[PDB]
């Protein structure tokens, strides 16, 4: 029912899927983003989190802040938070919601690291990422909103 409901729905539905067959999305940050993007019909760079960040860096509009990221997600756009790693990077889906410490937007993500890198919408990016990394995040937004108009039957 909210304007961005399709984002949260795609996050929820992608959680137990395995974009990389044999590897649950909750244990695979890249696969979880791929599955969300595919449910939304949003074309997404392939490969691991690092290669995905490279692709988004080349093609997607980069947002100025985490605040701005939650604002776009609230309008029904797919918003990816990403940061390259020395060995492994990490990507998450930004969702609308109160900012953590007035700065870091709520997110969904899986992770091969386990519970520390996982969020079912209950952690912000500033809790998922290390405190040295959370101020260094890149927020990329797709060029068209994914969600549709609310139902005509709505009051």
């Amino acid at each position: 029912d909210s304007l961005d409901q399709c984002i949260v729905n795609a996050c929820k539905n992608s959680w137990d899927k395995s974009y990389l067959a044999g590897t649950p999305n909750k244990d695979n940050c890249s696969g979880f983003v791929q599955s969300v993007a595919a449910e939304l019909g949003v074309p997404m760079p392939r490969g691991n989190a690092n290669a995905m960040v490279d692709g988004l860096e080349q093609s997607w509009t980069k947002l100025a802040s985490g605040a701005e990221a939650a604002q776009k997600a609230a309008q029904g756009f797919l918003v990816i938070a990403g940061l390259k790693g020395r060995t492994y990077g990490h990507v998450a889906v930004v969702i609308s919601g109160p900012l953590y410490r007035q700065k870091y937007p709520m997110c969904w993500c899986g992770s091969i690291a386990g519970a520390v890198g996982q969020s079912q919408g209950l952690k912000s990016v500033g809790q998922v990422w290390n405190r040295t990394d959370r101020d260094r995040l890149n927020y990329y937004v797709y060029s068209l909103a994914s969600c549709s108009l609310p139902r005509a039957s709505l009051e």
Side-chain angles (χ1 to χ4, degrees):
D1 224 324
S2 65
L3 225 59
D4 63 338
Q5 187 69 46
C6 88
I7 320 281
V8 180
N9 287 359
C11 288
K12 275 141 82 148
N13 296 333
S14 300
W15 187 253
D16 295 305
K17 283 182 181 179
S18 294
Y19 187 80
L20 184 73
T23 307
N25 283 354
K26 61 184 174 60
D27 301 323
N28 182 7
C29 70
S30 63
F32 172 79
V33 174
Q34 297 286 346
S35 285
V36 169
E39 180 171 322
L40 300 173
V42 175
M44 179 65 64
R46 66 159 319 264
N48 57 28
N50 272 7
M52 295 177 64
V53 173
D54 280 346
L56 300 163
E57 185 67 38
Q58 297 152 17
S59 306
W60 289 30
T61 304
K62 209 186 317 179
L63 292 174
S65 56
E68 169 157 57
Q71 296 171 30
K72 296 291 291 199
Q75 298 169 41
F77 286 85
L78 184 53
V79 179
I80 308 303
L83 190 64
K84 288 181 92 185
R86 155 82 196 95
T87 316
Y88 307 102
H90 190 76
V91 282
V93 179
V94 166
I95 60 165
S96 66
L99 300 196
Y100 168 62
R101 309 180 54 111
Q102 283 190 19
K103 190 164 168 158
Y104 311 98
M106 299 312 287
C107 75
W108 275 76
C109 53
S111 176
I112 198 192
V116 304
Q118 291 173 345
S119 187
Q120 289 185 269
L122 308 180
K123 283 168 192 178
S124 77
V125 300
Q127 288 150 303
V128 167
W129 270 276
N130 187 282
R131 51 162 285 183
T132 52
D133 293 332
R134 66 186 192 181
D135 292 327
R136 297 169 38 245
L137 305 181
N138 302 289
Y139 302 102
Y140 307 96
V141 61
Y142 191 53
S143 53
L144 290 172
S146 296
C147 309
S148 79
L149 286 165
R151 57 195 185 80
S153 63
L154 182 60
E155 283 189 310

